[PDB]
Each structure stands twice: as structure tokens, then as C-alpha cells.
Point group: C3
Chain length 235, copies 3
């Protein structure tokens, strides 16, 4: 039972569960949701209790993307230029992607556009069989492709990323699993149990070493092997 918080947060045994909680809107991303998760993520980094972070959706869908109704209100009347959704989303994507704790995305349902980009910023992705994935061209709209064009080619290769972006069809959890979009697929009934077990052994490990390792993985993409070895001879 929710208390109208935009983001339901619970911390159990070193695992911080951050669940999007607008199930009626399929957990559509709006500025209140963006900012709330953005501030709660900063609290998780500083908190010594949390050693792993889970990002999940409520109800049938993980996240349907940007809230078109909120965008409509700014567009239809008043300040469309003062609407700061893109600024709030890009700050959130950057922080989650570089978070110093191990992060897991529990794709309980469909992830679309910015909703899929939110899962791609996590280190791991476990998806339910019902989960469906949409990006770029939807058939009726075109999602923001900033983070998709950065994440998708790195996880899927260039061609596979262009099939998902340019074609309007959604990908199933099986197809996402086979293409490398998600790392693991479980039945929807066992998803919360599967994520908890996976996040538990992540939480049992040395969080400090994971933080340094996660920074080396990210920094290593832009430097040669010799540079990477030089950089690790320092701290």
C-alpha cells in the first residue's frame, strides 16, 4: 500500500529497492519521478548500509517513458521552453550509470524509450518473460534517442541496435536476452525473488572493490591497455 510518494523506497539487508510508483501511468517518467529517483540515488551512494541497488517498476509495466500528459500541459499552455524535463532526465541517466554501488534493473514489464534507457544505465538487467522493449520509432511516435544511441550499440552491436531503433516492432524478453539487451530472464512470478537473490550475493561482496572496478571499466573504454595499466598504478 503506497503513501503517494512518487518513488517507493525500501532498504532490506543492504539492498535498496527503488520502485517507480505510478502504475496507472505505466510508471511514466515525469520531473517529480526523475528528481525523486535522482535524489534517492545520491543518498544510496553516501549510505554505508546499502551495498546494492534495485530499480523496479510497479504493476504490469517497468516504465512507459516520458510522461506525455505533463509535456502536453507545458506545451498546450504556458512555458514549453521553461519545461526542464530533458535536463532532469539527463542528470538522472548520468548519475545512475556512474553510481558507485552495484545496480540491478528488474524489468517487470514493458520498457519504452526513456524507460528502457533507465534500465540500460544499470549494471545488470533481469527481465520477466512478459517484458517488452521499444526504442526509437514506435509506429506512432519517436522516443528520445540520446541514451539509446549510446547504450544500444555498446550492448547489441551497431546493426542490432539499428533494427530496434529504426523498426517499430517491440522485442520480447527472449529476443532481448538473445541479443544481449538483458542478462537474465525469469518468469514474472519469480522475478522479485530472483532479483533479491541476485542482489543479495552482490550485496555480500566487497562494495569498495566494486566501486573502483566499476570506475575502471568505464574509464577503460576511452584509453588503451597501456594507459589503463598506468592509471591503475595510482589512486
Amino acid at each position: 500500500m503506497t503513501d503517494l510518494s512518487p518513488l517507493q523506497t525500501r532498504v532490506e539487508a543492504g539492498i535498496a529497492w527503488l520502485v517507480l510508483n505510478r502504475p496507472q501511468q505505466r510508471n511514466a517518467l515525469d520531473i517529480p519521478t526523475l528528481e525523486a529517483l535522482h535524489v534517492r540515488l545520491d543518498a544510496c551512494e553516501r549510505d554505508p548500509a546499502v551495498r546494492a541497488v534495485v530499480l523496479g517498476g510497479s504493476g504490469r509495466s517497468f516504465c512507459a517513458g516520458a510522461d506525455l500528459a505533463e509535456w502536453a500541459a507545458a506545451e498546450a499552455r504556458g512555458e514549453l521552453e521553461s519545461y526542464g524535463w530533458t535536463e532532469a532526465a539527463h542528470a538522472l541517466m548520468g548519475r545512475l550509470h556512474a553510481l558507485d554501488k552495484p545496480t540491478v534493473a528488474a524489468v517487470n514489464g514493458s520498457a519504452v524509450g526513456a524507460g528502457m534507457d533507465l534500465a540500460l544505465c544499470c549494471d545488470f538487467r533481469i527481465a520477466a518473460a512478459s517484458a517488452r522493449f521499444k526504442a526509437g520509432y514506435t509506429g506512432m511516435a519517436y522516443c528520445p534517442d540520446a541514451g539509446a544511441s549510446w547504450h544500444l550499440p555498446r550492448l547489441l552491436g551497431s546493426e542490432a541496435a539499428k533494427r530496434l531503433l529504426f523498426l517499430d516492432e517491440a522485442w520480447s524478453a527472449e529476443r532481448a536476452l538473445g541479443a544481449g539487451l538483458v542478462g537474465e530472464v525469469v518468469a514474472d512470478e519469480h522475478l522479485v525473488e530472483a532479483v533479491g537473490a541476485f542482489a543479495a550475493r552482490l550485496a555480500s561482496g566487497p562494495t569498495f572493490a566494486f566501486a573502483q572496478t566499476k570506475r575502471l571499466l568505464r574509464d577503460g573504454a576511452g584509453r588503451s591497455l597501456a594507459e589503463q595499466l598506468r592509471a591503475e598504478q595510482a589512486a
Copy 2:
């Protein structure tokens, strides 16, 4: 029935078909072919009618690579230094790879060396079952490895790319499909039909959004996620 054009071009329903047309030479690449496709590609970018581009071969083979006979004539007598094949090929590879329209390579037959590099510059690759792929060491010769050494590790991973380049064996369409070299494999009888259907739904989508997305995919490979998000807050 051909009209001696080095490149047979037809535009149907927003799809520009560019077919190499030297079937006797297995569509070997020479300066006339390089330049013709090079100029026709520039016309496709500017043309609002074309919304997808197909690159195919004639007869049994997609492209056997550089025309050794043309190179022999320049080598055997006269100006081997004035031979500008490498300059014409590198200009073509760069333009095709960065083309602002969705590009599909219909690998109707074997692609060797620069012929394979021509297909790698396309966004998508659909191959017939008869198609065979050769790169680097052939057993009797060594193909230009400039574009291969750039494309192959990005599509196949380092080791798989080195197996194809250092070993003289050709890869089948099945092996190319499994390694990520091509995205789809169909029977040779259904190849033209399969490419047309795939290029049709690409042509039905928003071409303008694909152009911006294709530029973001390419630019995103050289910058971090935070930089990519900064860059997309501008146009």
C-alpha cells in the same frame, strides 16, 4: 537487360536500388565503379524521394574486391603511382558508412576484401545462403585491411575478426550470421523479395529521425554517456 552503365540504378517507392553490374568480373571494384556509386550515393542523400538505399551485386557474386586486371594495366605499363584506386575507394567507404539514409546490403553472393568492406559500411546486411565471405589472408593473396580492421572487430569482437583475417578460410552465410557479420540470412530465391520488404518498412519510417539517430550512434562511440547527453541537448 543492362545498358553498359557500370552501376544499374532504379528507384521504386522511396527505395533506391544500387546494383553493381559487372557480373563477368564478379562485380570487381574498379575506379569507374567506385566513382559511379560514389556519385549516385551523393544523389540519394539529396533526393527527398529515396528514403532507403539497397546495395546489391549482379549474378552469382556480390563483389569479388579490387579489380586486379585494372591494377595490372597500371602496374605493367605506365603510371602505377598515379593509379588512384585507394583514394577512390576510401572516399566511397567513408560516404556510404556515414550516409544520411538507411542503407541495406543485399549480399547475393560471395564478398571478398574491399567487396566485403562495402557491405560493412551499410547499416544492415541480409545475405543469401550461398554467400561466402573472405578477408585478409586468402591463401594466394592478402586483401586491403584498412576498413576490415576497423569494421570487423566492432561487429565480431577482436578474436573472431582475427580468425577471419589471419586464416585463409571463407565463412559461410550461417557462420557469418552466427558471428554477427550479417543480420539476416535467407534463401537466394527469396533474397530480392526479403530485401525489398525490409527496405520497405525502413522507407515507411521517419527518415529525418533516422538521420539524426544514425549520426548520434556514430558520434556516441567516441564520447562518454554524459558527453553524448550534452551533445543531444543541441542541434
Copy 3:
């Protein structure tokens, strides 16, 4: 029968076999082993006889990683700061990774930490079915992650590399094969025979062209396609 050399070296038919030879320590890496392989590798580059290089382990294991006993002696008494193991290892990893000859890693047994990093610096990896792979968190210790954080995401993708580093479980030869960690898996009884046959056809090819190609593959990762083509119009 060994002669107490830290590294057993034999050169047959253009193939230089470099076998770690401390089977009692599971071929644990210490400064004498690091330096010996480091100097022998430099001899292989200069030697025109060797056209392919094989790196193997002795006995049951390929390499168990850094020698903890040697580190203990420096730590327990005397000069832990003067201990130059990291410096010797990083010089070895850099040279092997950029070696001008084709290199093959014969993973005869388990490779752990720096031992796995040694195989990742080779161009090819053929593993026995008994081979097991450990990286990062072991359950009781945490291996150096400098080269792992550089190699593993490039071979396995980000998520798969983080599963191997953050989870303490080892990967089997089958799982390593399926994830792209090794290129080929054979029975332990046929490993030496399989590596010899693979290294033989590598040794039969044009070694000079492989050297230029191997440099282009490595340099191409940091530049665009247009830059790569500009660079190959020169030597």
C-alpha cells in the same frame, strides 16, 4: 623433464612454445616468471624463425595468478614498497598484447586473476574442457582488476564482464566459450594437438601482413573510420 628454467621454451617449425613451468604453484606469476616471459617475448618479435607464439601452462592449471607467497615474503619482512611485481606485470601485459606475431593462449587448466589477464592479451584462446576462469571477487580475495576491467568488457560486453568480476563463481570452458571469453574449446587430451594445428596454419601465413593488420586493429579502436582510412594511406 624440466631444467629449473622458470619458463620452458621450445621453437618448432616457426612456432615458439612458451610454457609457464611452476606446476607445483599452479604456475603462479612471480617476478622471475614475469621477467623471463617478458624477455623471451622480445626475442620472439626479433626472431625471423618464429611466426606464431603459443603461451601455455604446465600440469593441471594454466595460471593461478599472482604468487601470494612471494608477496608475503616482501610484506611480512622488509621492503613491501620496493616490491616491483605490479611494474613487472604491467610491462608484460602491454608487450604481449601488442606483440607483432600471432599469439595463441592454450588454456590447459584454470586461469585466475592475472593468469586470466595473461590469456586475454593473446590474440586467440583455445581452452580445455577442464579449464575454469575466475576474476575480481573470488569469495576469499579480490584479484587485480586493471587488465580485467579493460579486456573483459571488450570481449564479453559490460554486463557479462560485471557478472564475472562481481560474482565469486568461476566460469566453465563451455560458459567462457558461449560468452566469447575463449574462441575454441577442445578436450584436454587433444589440446596440445589442437593448438599446434591452429598455430601451424597461422605460422604458414604472411607474418608481415599480420603484424600490420594487428597494429591497425588496435589503432582503429581509437579513431573513426575516416581517420583509419587516412592512416592506412601511409606507412
